[PDB]
Amino acid sequence: KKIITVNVNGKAQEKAVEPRTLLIHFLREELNLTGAHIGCETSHCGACTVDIDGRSVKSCTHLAVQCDGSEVLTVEGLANKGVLHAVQEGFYKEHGLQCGFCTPGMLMRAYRFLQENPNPTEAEIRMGMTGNLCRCTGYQNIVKAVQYAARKLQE
Amino acid sequence: AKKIITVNVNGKAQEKAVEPRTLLIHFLREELNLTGAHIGCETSHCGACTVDIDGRSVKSCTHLAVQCDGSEVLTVEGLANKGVLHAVQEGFYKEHGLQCGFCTPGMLMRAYRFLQENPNPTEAEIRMGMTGNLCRCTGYQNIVKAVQYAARKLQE
Amino acid sequence: DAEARELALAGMGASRLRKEDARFIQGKGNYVDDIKMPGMLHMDIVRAPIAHGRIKKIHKDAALAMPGVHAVLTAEDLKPLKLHWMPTLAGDVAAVLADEKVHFQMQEVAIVIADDRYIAADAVEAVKVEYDELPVVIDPIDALKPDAPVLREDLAGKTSGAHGPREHHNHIFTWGAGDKAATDAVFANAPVTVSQHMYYPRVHPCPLETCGCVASFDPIKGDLTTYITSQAPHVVRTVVSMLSGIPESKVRIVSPDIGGGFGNKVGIYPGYVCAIVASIVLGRPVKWVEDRVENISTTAFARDYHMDGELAATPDGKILGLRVNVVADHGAFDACADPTKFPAGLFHICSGSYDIPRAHCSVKGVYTNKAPGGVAYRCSFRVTEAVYLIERMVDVLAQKLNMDKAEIRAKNFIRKEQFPYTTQFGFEYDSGDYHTALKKVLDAVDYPALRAEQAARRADPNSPTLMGIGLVTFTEVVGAGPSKMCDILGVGMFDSCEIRIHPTGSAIARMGTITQGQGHQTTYAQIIATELGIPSEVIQVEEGDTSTAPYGLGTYGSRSTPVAGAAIALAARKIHAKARKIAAHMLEVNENDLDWEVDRFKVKGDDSKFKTMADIAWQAYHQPPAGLEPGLEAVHYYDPPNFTYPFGIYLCVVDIDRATGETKVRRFYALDDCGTRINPMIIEGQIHGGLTEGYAVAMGQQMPFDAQGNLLGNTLMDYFLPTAVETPHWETDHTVTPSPHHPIGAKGVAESPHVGSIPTFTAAVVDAFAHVGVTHLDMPHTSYRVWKSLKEHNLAL
Amino acid sequence: VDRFKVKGDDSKFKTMADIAWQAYHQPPAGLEPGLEAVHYYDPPNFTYPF
Amino acid sequence: CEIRIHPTGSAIARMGTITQGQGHQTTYAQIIATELGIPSEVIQVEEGDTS
Amino acid sequence: MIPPRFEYHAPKSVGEAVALLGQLGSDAKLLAGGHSLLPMMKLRFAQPEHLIDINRIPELRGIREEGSTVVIGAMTVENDLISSPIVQARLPLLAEAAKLIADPQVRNRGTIGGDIAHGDPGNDHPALSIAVEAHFVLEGPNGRRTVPADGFFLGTYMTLLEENEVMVEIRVPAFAQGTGWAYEKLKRKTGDWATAGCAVVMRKSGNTVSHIRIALTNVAPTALRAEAAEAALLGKAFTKEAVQAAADAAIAICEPAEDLRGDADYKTAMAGQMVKRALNAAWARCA
Numbered sequence A: 001k002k003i004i005t006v007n008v009n010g011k012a013q014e015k016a017v018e019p020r021t022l023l024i025h026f027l028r029e030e031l032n033l034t035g036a037h038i039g040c041e042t043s044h045c046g047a048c049t050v051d052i053d054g055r056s057v058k059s060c061t062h063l064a065v066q067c068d069g070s071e072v073l074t075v076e077g078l079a080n081k082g083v084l085h086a087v088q089e090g091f092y093k094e095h096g097l098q099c100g101f102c103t104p105g106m107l108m109r110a111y112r113f114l115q116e117n118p119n120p121t122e123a124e125i126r127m128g129m130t131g132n133l134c135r136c137t138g139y140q141n142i143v144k145a146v147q148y149a150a151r152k153l154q155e
Numbered sequence B: 001a002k003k004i005i006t007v008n009v010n011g012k013a014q015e016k017a018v019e020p021r022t023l024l025i026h027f028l029r030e031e032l033n034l035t036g037a038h039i040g041c042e043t044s045h046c047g048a049c050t051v052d053i054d055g056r057s058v059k060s061c062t063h064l065a066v067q068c069d070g071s072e073v074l075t076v077e078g079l080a081n082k083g084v085l086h087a088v089q090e091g092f093y094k095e096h097g098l099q100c101g102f103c104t105p106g107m108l109m110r111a112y113r114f115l116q117e118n119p120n121p122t123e124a125e126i127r128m129g130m131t132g133n134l135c136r137c138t139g140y141q142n143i144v145k146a147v148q149y150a151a152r153k154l155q156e
Numbered sequence C: 001d002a003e004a005r006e007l008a009l010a011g012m013g014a015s016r017l018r019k020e021d022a023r024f025i026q027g028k029g030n031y032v033d034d035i036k037m038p039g040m041l042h043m044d045i046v047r048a049p050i051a052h053g054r055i056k057k058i059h060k061d062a063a064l065a066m067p068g069v070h071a072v073l074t075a076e077d078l079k080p081l082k083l084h085w086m087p088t089l090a091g092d093v094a095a096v097l098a099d100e101k102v103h104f105q106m107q108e109v110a111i112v113i114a115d116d117r118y119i120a121a122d123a124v125e126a127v128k129v130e131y132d133e134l135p136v137v138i139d140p141i142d143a144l145k146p147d148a149p150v151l152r153e154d155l156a157g158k159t160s161g162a163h164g165p166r167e168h169h170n171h172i173f174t175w176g177a178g179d180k181a182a183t184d185a186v187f188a189n190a191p192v193t194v195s196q197h198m199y200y201p202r203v204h205p206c207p208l209e210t211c212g213c214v215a216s217f218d219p220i221k222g223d224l225t226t227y228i229t230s231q232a233p234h235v236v237r238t239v240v241s242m243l244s245g246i247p248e249s250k251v252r253i254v255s256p257d258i259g260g261g262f263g264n265k266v267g268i269y270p271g272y273v274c275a276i277v278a279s280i281v282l283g284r285p286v287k288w289v290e291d292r293v294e295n296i297s298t299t300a301f302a303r304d305y306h307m308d309g310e311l312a313a314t315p316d317g318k319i320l321g322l323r324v325n326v327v328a329d330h331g332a333f334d335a336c337a338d339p340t341k342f343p344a345g346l347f348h349i350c351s352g353s354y355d356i357p358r359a360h361c362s363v364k365g366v367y368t369n370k371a372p373g374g375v376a377y378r379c380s381f382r383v384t385e386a387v388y389l390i391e392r393m394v395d396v397l398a399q400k401l402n403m404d405k406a407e408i409r410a411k412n413f414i415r416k417e418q419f420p421y422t423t424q425f426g427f428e429y430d431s432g433d434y435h436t437a438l439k440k441v442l443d444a445v446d447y448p449a450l451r452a453e454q455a456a457r458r459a460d461p462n463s464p465t466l467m468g469i470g471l472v473t474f475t476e477v478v479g480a481g482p483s484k485m486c487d488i489l490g491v492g493m494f495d496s497c498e499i500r501i502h503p504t505g506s507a508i509a510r511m512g513t514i515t516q517g518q519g520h521q522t523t524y525a526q527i528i529a530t531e532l533g534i535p536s537e538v539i540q541v542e543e544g545d546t547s548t549a550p551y552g553l554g555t556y557g558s559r560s561t562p563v564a565g566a567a568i569a570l571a572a573r574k575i576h577a578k579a580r581k582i583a584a585h586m587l588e589v590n591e592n593d594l595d596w597e598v599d600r601f602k603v604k605g606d607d608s609k610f611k612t613m614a615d616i617a618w619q620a621y622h623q624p625p626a627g628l629e630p631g632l633e634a635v636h637y638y639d640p641p642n643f644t645y646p647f648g649i650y651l652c653v654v655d656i657d658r659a660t661g662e663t664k665v666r667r668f669y670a671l672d673d674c675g676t677r678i679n680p681m682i683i684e685g686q687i688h689g690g691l692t693e694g695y696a697v698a699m700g701q702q703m704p705f706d707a708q709g710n711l712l713g714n715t716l717m718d719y720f721l722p723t724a725v726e727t728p729h730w731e732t733d734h735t736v737t738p739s740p741h742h743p744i745g746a747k748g749v750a751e752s753p754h755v756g757s758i759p760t761f762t763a764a765v766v767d768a769f770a771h772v773g774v775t776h777l778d779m780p781h782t783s784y785r786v787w788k789s790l791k792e793h794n795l796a797l
Numbered sequence D: 001v002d003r004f005k006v007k008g009d010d011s012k013f014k015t016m017a018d019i020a021w022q023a024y025h026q027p028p029a030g031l032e033p034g035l036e037a038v039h040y041y042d043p044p045n046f047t048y049p050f
Numbered sequence E: 001c002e003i004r005i006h007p008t009g010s011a012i013a014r015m016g017t018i019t020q021g022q023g024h025q026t027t028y029a030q031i032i033a034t035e036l037g038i039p040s041e042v043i044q045v046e047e048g049d050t051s
Numbered sequence F: 001m002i003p004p005r006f007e008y009h010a011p012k013s014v015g016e017a018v019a020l021l022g023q024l025g026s027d028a029k030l031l032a033g034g035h036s037l038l039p040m041m042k043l044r045f046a047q048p049e050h051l052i053d054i055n056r057i058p059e060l061r062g063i064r065e066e067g068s069t070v071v072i073g074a075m076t077v078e079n080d081l082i083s084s085p086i087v088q089a090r091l092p093l094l095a096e097a098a099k100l101i102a103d104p105q106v107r108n109r110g111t112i113g114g115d116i117a118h119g120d121p122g123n124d125h126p127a128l129s130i131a132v133e134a135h136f137v138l139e140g141p142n143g144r145r146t147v148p149a150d151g152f153f154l155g156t157y158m159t160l161l162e163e164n165e166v167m168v169e170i171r172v173p174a175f176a177q178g179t180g181w182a183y184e185k186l187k188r189k190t191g192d193w194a195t196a197g198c199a200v201v202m203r204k205s206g207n208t209v210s211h212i213r214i215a216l217t218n219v220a221p222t223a224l225r226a227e228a229a230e231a232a233l234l235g236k237a238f239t240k241e242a243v244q245a246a247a248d249a250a251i252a253i254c255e256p257a258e259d260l261r262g263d264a265d266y267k268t269a270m271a272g273q274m275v276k277r278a279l280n281a282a283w284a285r286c287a
């Protein structure tokens, strides 16, 4: 086992982990940050997406041990002092979620994508959100949710 | 500073680190979630926190957890074996020795030990032997019957 | 197969074992302090060291700087939410956190929130408070003096209160019942007249589990969930909703397993309000669990009635009138649990088990520098005081006329044929048979032989012990309900039950009451078992969760059996009527060609053609007969037509040691009649507990204050509670006189042993001194006090 | 919308809130306290959206 | 469906169905809202728990 | 309920415990059965910064006979006194009187040495140790010393014991054949401290009292030895008048505190009453 120190949502977490432990299970099982979900074992769905060291990453294809000294942000950390982040507000206002299973991953992705590209076109949004699957929405309202967040972020 | 200790509770090793002032009752309830033992006073009279430590009945609210490093602690959760109720639990059940159940875990742990100290107790001996345990609901009458029931079951 | 099928139901009348036991005997109960939630913090309270005084300054800095402490709140943090004061069940207001001043010692002044209870307790000690002492008021009589200090400066200028006009700043109310003029007329000319002052001491219900709660406001969902030691969770939800502004549907109150309530957990304490507020502010769970000292010192006390009784009669012992005057000590704020129209509860039931043609009572409540309360500890809303008054007065009358104490009662008893009897105070006693019950007790204990033995001991001047025989014949009033008459903060005192039968025959049932150990999960199931032919073992009952249980008024005043017991039977009967309709359809016959036999509907004249409740349940889900909705369930809200009036005949023999003053209970026989009995085993337990509490009150309990207002003996070091050694062996008996208006004829009974046994003990102790002219002795009858009396009457050793 | 008003006189009315409280305070003669209902619906036919 | 109105006007409702994302907690509240003049926002709906 | 923070020390020898008392000072307190110390700490009546647990010291335990002297280790738990076949045979007064102390649970923790060192007038052993003529062995930085029970109690919670000492054991002479004894304890309930109590140990000679010791419990700031009460019986015949004279002599020295157990008037009269009863009970036990 390797002792690591991961900064999760602004708080330092020193834990002893087995090398094979997937980051997604470390977050869900050890820290009880159950927002991130699992929808596949092949790395396609993106329901496990979290922000690691400034980038969107599918936590099911990353080891917890690799996060020693990293900065990890999960959906539970998006709201600031209880005030929703623009992406959370956009998804809510534009009905960008139904069963809510792909939502945390979608929000974590959108959170970073909007920093990568602040004024995205619809095509760029669809392409920028390609790593995340959704079975409920048909993506249309998600595009609007991201557009709503983009406008609010430059407000 | 927290002291690292290992206390055997119900035959299982419990490795923890607690401040020296930690009362055994809070250790069991707070650290191990063995919430059977209860707190009914701050003056050591009620006995609702009674647990069996190293072969003796002890009020866990008046004993330090740090004094138990290596001890054998028995709580109500460990009386039943393989699901079968201990004679003491069966006695309280059959004789209606409990109403709200708050003093019950303490009564059971005390009766468990009492019956070993005295296998064939008279009523006076039972009332006196259970004297360190307070009950607000029963009026004790059925509790002595429950103990008499258990005493009888253990001899058969 | 009929008698066997009924027996297998383990329903009405069966002494079946408890369904609750399993979890409790294995430490799997779920009480407030067993609860642990994610992010849960702990709250402790900084309390007042003095009884009366102005708050100069509160120091928060040292406590706040301490690691582990998240917040320190005072009345200032509560003002913006209008929560530094809260409304009470008595129509007055109580301080949540002391604002400008403190009204009683140990009062809540500030709160700290910390990582755990250890740090929290440290934080309390770190908070320093500066006070300006004010003159204390501990005696009710001294409180009404012109120069007496103003306790409640918040209601300065008010000439009326929630219960009528107020004559003095420390005067709360004056309430009366009966015919004053008629009563005064009888007493003005009656040939025999007796008077007796007696004090019913302030005592505490002291449940083994103290009060506490885990308040959890979820800022994400915007709803409040608080686990609490409450005997009326639904009422608490409505009140919390209105005081907080949070829509009621988003407020969930849940009374889990409660380690005894005994009326001590009916009200809302500042501790609950503070935990809720802190939780809202911190956006996380806050746990509050008081210590024993805090429970005895600040939660609801019982009694504290200064009473002056009077009886008018003819020389043969026939009572002509009753006149009573009482001064009630309610402490700082009037938070006395009672229906809004009865500031003195049902004290006007003090005419007792006797046909008294003229009576009148008057109660005056006053403020003092003490904790709120008054109604608790199995009192049935001041019935304890009412029964004690009349029974002591009857003994006084018997002694002045030199008349036997049993004889004078049999002479004044309401005759069996007089029921339903309307008293001089307006109560309509449902049913009773006192003469038969008294004879049963007298014969059982060989009363004449007891009197003979007593006569012999009294003869020898050197008998080392005094013998006293105490006898009480009382009538209770339980089942607070008629909405036109009874309401809690505006809510009619009804109750409810909801039963749902599953496709396979078993069922789930929820009521608006809440057990604290009296066995509802077993008994309620038994009532339904008999009504529907489904074994009680598979009828799961639950109470306490405002999100699942039908709205009710909770459990106190022994109202469960009378009110909820009725709602349960009626709800079940709604299901039984539908079951018949379904059975008739399946059997292809008319409904009244059907007979109900234990657990099935069978065709008259043909035993082979029948359908069981299981058969019917399945049919209800499979294919509902035309004109019927699928399913099989019912809900019923019962507004009782009258209270229930159980009675009892209690006898106690005591032997007092002349050298030490210590009293030994030689025998105690208790006969109770609560109508139809649901579970005898459970009833017997309630009696044992009740009689034990009575012994505790009459023989050892008290809450003395010194001249400075300090509460003395507020811990188990001095506050008396008997162990198995002190508790006598109880002898119980019964008769069955059903309540005519009740769906199953069952009356409440739980409070009877407490209400009746207390004056029985006093009756026995006083009767031990009767031969030297003693008419009354104030409780507690401790060795010390009894010795002072032996000394005073030259009976010492 | 949210109240029962007397025909003609608009000023005389009672909201569902007023009615709810009354149901708990003191039920009119012949009625049980409370304001709740249960209903099991066995449909007469399917629904045919297009 | 079982609907219970509280003393203060708000309500709780439970149905024998079980949403899996189709929005029953919002839509069911709207139906009842129009039927009783109680805002859908305070009509709390739940499903899925057989107890 | 919550005691203040403190450091825990658990030395395995009397010598090291004494050493800790020295280096830590008055800020340290010896932790025996904890059934007086912990309750006071929980109510914050006492707030030592250090606790020196003496439960792991073997020489503080054991009950042995050294000739005609019974030696009880200070750490002897209350219940072991009751079940000791030696105490039962040589000091039956202590085995029977111990049954009147607290409850079973407390008795499995509280020690005879802690009951005495605590110096509370409410405790039963102080008067018992006087009537039985016990001697306490104390160990400090300068070695040991043996002091008698009579004169060991100075005030409420105050004894001859120094801040840097540890009571090792309790030496008491075995009862001579035919010794009469008794302990009369008036109490509000089981497990409560006495309202008044009297310990009596006496020996007979034909029909006269040859040896007598009378001690009073909880009727003064400390346990009292009723010397004048003894003087009313020594060498005199055992009569009803003699007993009353003793009772009057016991009563005369009482200086009870007024509290919830009663006033000085009651406690004094009760002390006398317990004396009368103890003397008659003790006499009846003489052979």
Ligand SMILES: Cc1cc2nc3c(=O)[nH]c(=O)nc-3n(C[C@H](O)[C@H](O)[C@H](O)COP(=O)(O)OP(=O)(O)OC[C@H]3O[C@@H](n4cnc5c(N)ncnc54)[C@H](O)[C@@H]3O)c2cc1C
Pocket: B043, B044, B045, F029, F030, F031, F032, F033, F034, F035, F036, F037, F038, F039, F074, F075, F100, F101, F102, F103, F106, F109, F110, F111, F112, F113, F114, F115, F116, F117, F118, F122, F123, F124, F125, F161, F165, F166, F167, F168, F191, F192, F193, F194
């Ligand atoms: C509910 C209750 C009821 C009780 N009832 C009674 C009763 O009826 N009669 C009665 O007599 N007692 C009674 N007690 C007290 C038990 O009997 C007192 O337990 C014990 O007085 C103080 O002994 P301890 O062994 O527990 O030591 P502790 O509680 O640890 O106290 C020891 C005290 O003496 C010092 N000390 C202890 N051992 C030594 C030693 N070997 N050398 C030097 N100093 C030492 C400590 O520093 C401290 O000041 C009761 C206690 C409780 C909680």
Ligand code: PCD
Pocket: B099, B100, B137, C231, C259, C260, C261, C262, C263, C264, C266, C375, C376, C377, C378, C379, C380, C381, C516, C517, C518, C519, C520, C523, C524, C555, C556, C557, C558, C559, C560, C561, C562, C674, C675, C676, C677, C678, C679, C680, C682, C683, C686, C689, C746, C747, C748, C749, C750, C751
């Ligand atoms: N006839 C008849 C009657 C009765 N029963 C039963 O018995 C029981 C009882 O009931 P009642 O009487 O009805 O009552 P409740 O309501 O239930 O209860 C209450 C009470 O109860 C008592 N007791 C008890 N116990 C216990 N255990 N716990 C508690 O807590 C208690 N508390 C107390 C009090 S106080 Mo108040 O509040 O002051 O007013 S009131 C009171 C129940 O189960 C029932 O069912 C029967 O069986 N039968």
Ligand code: FES
Pocket: A037, A038, A039, A040, A041, A042, A043, A044, A045, A046, A047, A048, A049, A058, A059, A060, A061
């Ligand atoms: S679980 Fe599907 S990409 Fe991670």
Ligand code: FES
Pocket: A096, A097, A098, A099, A100, A101, A102, A103, A133, A134, A135, A136, A137, E021
């Ligand atoms: S909202 Fe259900 S999968 Fe996206």
Ligand code: FES
Pocket: B038, B039, B040, B041, B042, B043, B044, B045, B046, B047, B048, B049, B050, B059, B060, B061, B062
């Ligand atoms: S909590 Fe009362 S004796 Fe332990």
Ligand code: FES
Pocket: B097, B098, B099, B100, B101, B102, B103, B104, B134, B135, B136, B137, B138, C208, C259, C260, C517
């Ligand atoms: S059963 Fe409730 S205190 Fe014992």
